[PDB]
């Protein structure tokens, strides 16, 4: 029963946590995509500049 | 939040930028101009002078 509440403490539930990961990379992989639409903007400025 | 007001003051809306520049250039055109025929007034009064 110490072995079953220490490992309540320390050991994850890897189920939990691959979807954690899963749900962060993606929010990572969204987040440089928002840099491939956040670098294009002033390209356009230029585009009224030409 | 620094690095946006500190662009704020000092970095320039370059399409408002712009527009001054196009206007401006006009009114230098315009100035030019003006003196193409501002010039152009003394040779009339060559012309009644023969």
């Given at each position: ?24 990379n ?25």
């Amino acid at each position: 029963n110490l072995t079953a509440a220490e490992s309540r403490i320390r050991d994850v539930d890897m189920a939990k946590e691959m979807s954690e990961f899963t749900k962060n990379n993606i929010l990572s992989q969204a987040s440089q995509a928002m840099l491939a639409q956040a670098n294009q903007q002033p390209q356009n400025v230029l585009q009224l500049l030409r």
